[PDB]
Amino acid sequence: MEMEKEFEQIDKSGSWAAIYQDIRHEASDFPSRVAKLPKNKNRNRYRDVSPFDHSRIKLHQEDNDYINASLIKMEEAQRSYILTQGPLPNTVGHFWEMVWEQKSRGVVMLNRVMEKGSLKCAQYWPQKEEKEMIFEDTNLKLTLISEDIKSYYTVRQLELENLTTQETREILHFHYTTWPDFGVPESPASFLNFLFKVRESGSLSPEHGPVVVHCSAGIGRSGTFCLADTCLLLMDKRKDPSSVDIKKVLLEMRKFRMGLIQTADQLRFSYLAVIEGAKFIMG
Numbered sequence: 001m002e003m004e005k006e007f008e009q010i011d012k013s014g015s016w017a018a019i020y021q022d023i024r025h026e027a028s029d030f031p032s033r034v035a036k037l038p039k040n041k042n043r044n045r046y047r048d049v050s051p052f053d054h055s056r057i058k059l060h061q062e063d064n065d066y067i068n069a070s071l072i073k074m075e076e077a078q079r080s081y082i083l084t085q086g087p088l089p090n091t092v093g094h095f096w097e098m099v100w101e102q103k104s105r106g107v108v109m110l111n112r113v114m115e116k117g118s119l120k121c122a123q124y125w126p127q128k129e130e131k132e133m134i135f136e137d138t139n140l141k142l143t144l145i146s147e148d149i150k151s152y153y154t155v156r157q158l159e160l161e162n163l164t165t166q167e168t169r170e171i172l173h174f175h176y177t178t179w180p181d182f183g184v185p186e187s188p189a190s191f192l193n194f195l196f197k198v199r200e201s202g203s204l205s206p207e208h209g210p211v212v213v214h215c216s217a218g219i220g221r222s223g224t225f226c227l228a229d230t231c232l233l234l235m236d237k238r239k240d241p242s243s244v245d246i247k248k249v250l251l252e253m254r255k256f257r258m259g260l261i262q263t264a265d266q267l268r269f270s271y272l273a274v275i276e277g278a279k280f281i282m283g
């Protein structure tokens, strides 16, 4: 079926939970043996969210190459993304090592450091220009260059220096600051505006390594971001845009990381975002 009318048909019939449970039943199951090794317990935020062995990002290190991060490679859309958990106190150096080694330009953050009165990820970037951060375990230095605070999101320019080689690179930090503590946003308008700002920066384009996207677990909000981006790109590429099937795209992405889209409300919100976004691209 088309999307917008499949949408009203699920709303009127109140069957979002049944649709979402079908997706969960059909999703891929692949091994995650490296994630479950005992030496990696303090590298995982949640015991039930792990990268598959076949698609995990490897750190260029001979001691321990493990990070909780997955490469999502979308062949028809010609887009790639790295989805990862929010960094932990003992993985902030690994996180920036990955950004460096994978040649990423942008980092997309969809959570606040504290939500619901608890810590959802480490304070992994500097908050003042004159107070830079050094990650001694991976030999990197990170400096805040500029910051632009808007009503729904903040954009930061960061400088990452590899201290072994003295090479430097500019990294863009795109921080969506207004996702509610409970549920999903009422309108997708600010989320779509944010997606378009990431796109306009070059961070999603083939001349750079894959964008790094995270929330707390790296599967819920993060899944919504890449699902919406890929569906809108396919609608631009194909002769028949109504052939794009959001449930099929989501199942394809779940071949590369488990659990993408965590609730039926996130599924409905993804439909809403793609539907509204398709009108702005053109109508």
Ligand SMILES: FC(F)(F)c1ccc(Nc2n[nH]c(=S)s2)cc1
Binding pocket: 145, 157, 158, 159, 160, 169, 170, 171
């Ligand atoms: F690393 C980097 F790419 F993010 C970067 C570092 C430093 C500057 N310098 C200046 N901006 N405006 C000035 S006036 S001087 C610009 C960009």
Ligand SMILES: FC(F)(F)c1ccc(Nc2n[nH]c(=S)s2)cc1
Binding pocket: 046, 047, 048, 049, 111, 215, 216, 217, 218, 219, 220, 221
């Ligand atoms: F147990 C568990 F695996 F099921 C699980 C429980 C809780 C979360 N919390 C969050 N995920 N994403 C956020 S943003 S907050 C994630 C996973």
